[PDB]
Amino acid sequence: VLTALELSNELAKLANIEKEFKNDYRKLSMQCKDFVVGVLDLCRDSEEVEAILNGDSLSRVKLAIKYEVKKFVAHPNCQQQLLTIWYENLSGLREQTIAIKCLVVLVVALGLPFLAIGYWIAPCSRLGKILRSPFMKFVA
Amino acid sequence: YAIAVVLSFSRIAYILPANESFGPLQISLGRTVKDIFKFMVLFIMVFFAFMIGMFILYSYYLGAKVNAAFTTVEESFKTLFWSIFGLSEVTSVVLKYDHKFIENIGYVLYGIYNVTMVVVLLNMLIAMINSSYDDSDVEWKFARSKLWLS
Amino acid sequence: VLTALELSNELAKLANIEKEFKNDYRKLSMQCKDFVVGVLDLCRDSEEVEAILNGDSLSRVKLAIKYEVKKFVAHPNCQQQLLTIWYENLSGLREQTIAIKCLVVLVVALGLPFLAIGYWIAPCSRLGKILRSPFMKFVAHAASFIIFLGLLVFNASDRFEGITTLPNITVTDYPKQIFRVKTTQFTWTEMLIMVWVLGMMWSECKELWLEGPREYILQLWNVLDFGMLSIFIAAFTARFLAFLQATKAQQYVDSYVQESDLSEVTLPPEIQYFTYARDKWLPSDPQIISEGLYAIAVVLSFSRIAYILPANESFGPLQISLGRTVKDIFKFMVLFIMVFFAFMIGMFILYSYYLGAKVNAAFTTVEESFKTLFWSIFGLSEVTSVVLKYDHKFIENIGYVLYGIYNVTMVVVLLNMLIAMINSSYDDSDVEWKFARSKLWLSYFDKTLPPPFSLVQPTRYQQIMKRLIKRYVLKAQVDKENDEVNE
Ligand SMILES: O=C(c1cc2c(s1)CCCCC2)N1CCC(n2c(=O)[nH]c3ccccc32)CC1
Ligand SMILES: O=C(c1cc2c(s1)CCCCC2)N1CCC(n2c(=O)[nH]c3ccccc32)CC1
Numbered sequence: 001v002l003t004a005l006e007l008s009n010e011l012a013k014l015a016n017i018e019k020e021f022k023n024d025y026r027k028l029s030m031q032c033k034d035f036v037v038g039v040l041d042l043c044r045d046s047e048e049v050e051a052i053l054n055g056d057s058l059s060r061v062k063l064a065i066k067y068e069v070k071k072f073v074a075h076p077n078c079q080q081q082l083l084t085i086w087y088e089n090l091s092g093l094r095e096q097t098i099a100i101k102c103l104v105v106l107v108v109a110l111g112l113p114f115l116a117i118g119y120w121i122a123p124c125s126r127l128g129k130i131l132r133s134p135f136m137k138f139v140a
Numbered sequence: 141y142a143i144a145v146v147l148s149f150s151r152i153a154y155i156l157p158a159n160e161s162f163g164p165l166q167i168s169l170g171r172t173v174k175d176i177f178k179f180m181v182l183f184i185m186v187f188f189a190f191m192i193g194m195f196i197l198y199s200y201y202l203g204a205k206v207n208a209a210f211t212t213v214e215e216s217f218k219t220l221f222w223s224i225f226g227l228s229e230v231t232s233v234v235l236k237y238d239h240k241f242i243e244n245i246g247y248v249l250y251g252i253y254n255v256t257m258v259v260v261l262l263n264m265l266i267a268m269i270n271s272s273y274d275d276s277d278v279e280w281k282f283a284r285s286k287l288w289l290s
Numbered sequence: 291v292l293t294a295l296e297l298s299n300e301l302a303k304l305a306n307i308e309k310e311f312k313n314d315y316r317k318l319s320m321q322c323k324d325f326v327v328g329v330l331d332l333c334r335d336s337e338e339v340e341a342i343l344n345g346d347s348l349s350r351v352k353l354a355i356k357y358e359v360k361k362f363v364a365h366p367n368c369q370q371q372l373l374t375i376w377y378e379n380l381s382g383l384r385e386q387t388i389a390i391k392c393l394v395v396l397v398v399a400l401g402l403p404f405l406a407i408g409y410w411i412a413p414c415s416r417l418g419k420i421l422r423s424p425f426m427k428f429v430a431h432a433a434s435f436i437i438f439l440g441l442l443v444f445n446a447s448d449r450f451e452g453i454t455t456l457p458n459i460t461v462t463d464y465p466k467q468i469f470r471v472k473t474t475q476f477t478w479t480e481m482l483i484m485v486w487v488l489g490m491m492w493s494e495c496k497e498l499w500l501e502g503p504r505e506y507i508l509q510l511w512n513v514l515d516f517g518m519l520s521i522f523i524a525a526f527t528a529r530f531l532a533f534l535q536a537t538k539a540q541q542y543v544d545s546y547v548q549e550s551d552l553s554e555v556t557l558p559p560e561i562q563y564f565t566y567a568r569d570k571w572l573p574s575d576p577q578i579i580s581e582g583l584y585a586i587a588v589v590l591s592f593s594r595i596a597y598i599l600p601a602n603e604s605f606g607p608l609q610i611s612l613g614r615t616v617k618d619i620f621k622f623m624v625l626f627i628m629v630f631f632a633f634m635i636g637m638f639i640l641y642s643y644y645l646g647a648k649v650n651a652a653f654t655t656v657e658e659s660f661k662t663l664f665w666s667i668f669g670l671s672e673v674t675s676v677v678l679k680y681d682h683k684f685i686e687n688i689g690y691v692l693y694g695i696y697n698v699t700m701v702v703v704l705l706n707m708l709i710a711m712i713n714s715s716y717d718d719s720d721v722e723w724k725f726a727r728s729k730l731w732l733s734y735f736d737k738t739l740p741p742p743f744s745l746v747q748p749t750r751y752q753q754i755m756k757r758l759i760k761r762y763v764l765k766a767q768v769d770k771e772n773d774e775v776n777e
Binding site for chain 3 (some may be wrong): 175178179181182185186188189190192193194195196197199200201202203204211212213214223226228229230237238239240241242245247249251254258259262263265266267269270
């Protein structure tokens with residue numbers, strides 16, 4: 001999978017450099033991307049999905065983002081893992097409606113100075129884990 | 141400060157990809173902006189051609205025109221730009237002298253400029269339509285995943 | 291390959307001639323083009339590619355360009371060979387970015403006279419090979435066009451912020467001078483503009499005489515270029531007659547009357563005419579005609595960018611789409627003209643009898659009716675164009691209804707034209723742009739100086755062709771077998 005990602009990037013760079021056989025190199029890079037996406041698609045356990053998404057820190061997801069391997073990142077096997085970290089330390093809030101999320105954003109907007117000053121003790125408190133989740137960082 | 145305040149609201153683009161409904165909208169906007177730029181370049185070329193033509197035609201009638209419209213480069217640019225959205229009147233090409241050759245040539249050039257602007261607008265719309273085509277879904281999910289990993 | 295090219299051309303001509311079985315002949319011509327493209331595609335060595343691209347001087351590429359075999363010219367096997375000649379004598383510059391190429395164009399624009407004068411020794415120097423490459427010829431021509439546009443803009447300087455004297459007032463260097471002499475005398479910049487315009491005229495006349503009038507007319511863009519050059523020539527001729535009249539007046543006034551100041555002189559009316567200001571010129575004054583034609587020529591000069599856009603990778607497809615749509619643009623403008631003329635005649639006939647009876651002179655003459663109906667398209671005419679000063683509500687209401695129906699019909703025709711353009715909009719665009727770019731390249735393959743500076747043991751080929759045709763037959767048979775091996 002790492003070999004296919006690197007080869008896809010190399011073939012895309014060659015497609016840019018040549019411009020004569022750009023279609024050939026783009027087709028080859030698409031072949032590499034398709035291979036990576038299919039190998040990810042074969043996964044049927046969390047262990048396999050993790051092994052694909054980071055090698056031996058989502059390393060392969062970051063590499064695919066860098067190399068514009070869009071179908072690998074957008075695959076449900078990767079998306080579920082990304083949502084796992086995204087909605088970390090907060091499980092019920094994932095299932096809430098969009099209106100509840102907007103209300104949470106409004107509450108955070110109202111009370112941002114209070115939580116900011118409480119961050120001096122938050123890591124020793126439970127609320128520090130809540131505010132340190134990626135979704136809460138985005139909301140903040 | 142006014143320009144900075146206007147540009148501040150552009151930071152919404154860092155938040156829309158997270159939303160499920162507006163993310164695809166931003167994706168389509170990004171899809172079309174690439175040919176928006178090229179057709180604005182074409183607009184600029186045609187606009188500059190007609191602007192130079194109008195200014196050269198009407199530069200010698202600063203006090204001889206009912207309306208100071210094409211008598212300077214600034215004024216020519218202003219009237220030709222605001223003719224795109226219809227905020228300039230047709231009396232921009234009327235003289236106070238009995239030179240029907242200059243006035244009629246100005247009329248013809250201004251009408252041709254309007255027709256050319258409409259034609260370029262329609263071509264840009266059709267190019268945008270062609271560039272518009274579950275690739276949109278994976279594109280939006282890629283953008284949202286980049287936002288998450290940030 | 292030559293047989294297939296010739297047969298494709300013949301079948302296209304038959305498709306045009308018949309028009310009953312046009313689809314059959316077009317399908318056959320497409321078959322011939324496909325055969326040629328496939329035979330080219332089979333090549334896997336430079337020797338084979340050359341043998342295909344020119345027979346036993348890119349002869350077959352030129353023939354395919356003539357016969358509109360677009361996929362053969364746009365094939366990568368042909369494109370790499372074309373880039374080889376295009377980027378000749380300059381290898382590193384091929385890999386440079388677009389910004390570096392633009393910087394090279396700017397440098398050439400700045401130093402064009404220096405390299406032009408150095409061309410007297412350049413063939414004996416290394417730089418002669420550099421400037422004689424097709425890419426450098428194209429860059430030199432683009433720089434020449436840029437310099438021409440710069441001259442056109444710079445000749446209008448000192449008026450960018452507006453003129454300082456009112457058109458009613460005359461300013462002369464010395465009292466003995468005729469005002470029209472000062473207004474018509476030539477400065478250096480428009481002398482260079484004339485030299486350049488004569489350069490492009492001489493070039494265009496060269497291709498016109500080489501190709502013939504009937505052949506040259508059939509290209510619309512070529513006749514557009516010829517018209518632009520002829521409008522420049524007409525404007526400068528009118529300026530020259532104005533200058534001749536002014537200098538005749540100056541000769542008369544200096545020869546005959548002997549006074550310190552010309553203002554006190556009561557000149558004869560023929561000589562006195564050339565002392566008046568802008569306001570008191572005749573409507574058919576030669577300088578008025580000169581300025582009017584010069585403005586149109588300046589506007590049309592910027593259309594020459596169409597000779598440079600196909601070289602660019604990003605704007606070439608844009609020009610291709612513009613050319614795709616212009617064909618139905620013309621037809622729907624014809625429909626616009628039909629509807630417009632119908633409504634114009636109707637409006638004029640309705641409102642011709644109310645010249646002094648209307649709040650606004652809008653449809654009282656053919657000129658006025660045309661003006662108001664044309665500027666209603668872009669919304670620069672008001673609705674009070676159909677209002678009378680008399681109590682004739684029948685005429686006024688009929689005018690209202692006709693004007694509203696005209697607006698609705700214009701909108702409907704516009705939307706239909708947009709939809710027709712959308713339908714006409716549909717990697718054929720890529721091959722079309724590459725065909726246009728290859729035509730641009732081959733125009734420069736075999737012109738070294740810009741128009742302003744132009745004033746001064748059967749056979750090896752038979753063996754290769756037999757090998758390629760054997761390859762084609764084997765590949766076709768293998769494809770047929772793989773299609774029907776099971777049966
Ligand atoms: O609006 C116009 C325009 C012309 C054109 C425009 S616009 C651009 C696209 C349409 C074709 C060219 N003009 C010019 C001449 C007009 N004009 C008279 O001066 N006498 C006339 C007698 C009959 C019909 C028209 C008359 C006055 C104003
Ligand atoms: O603008 C209009 C237009 C009509 C139509 C136009 S345009 C074209 C497309 C729409 C249908 C035809 N007209 C005409 C008559 C109007 N009119 C009175 O004169 N008395 C009225 C009493 C009720 C409603 C309208 C009244 C005055 C101005």
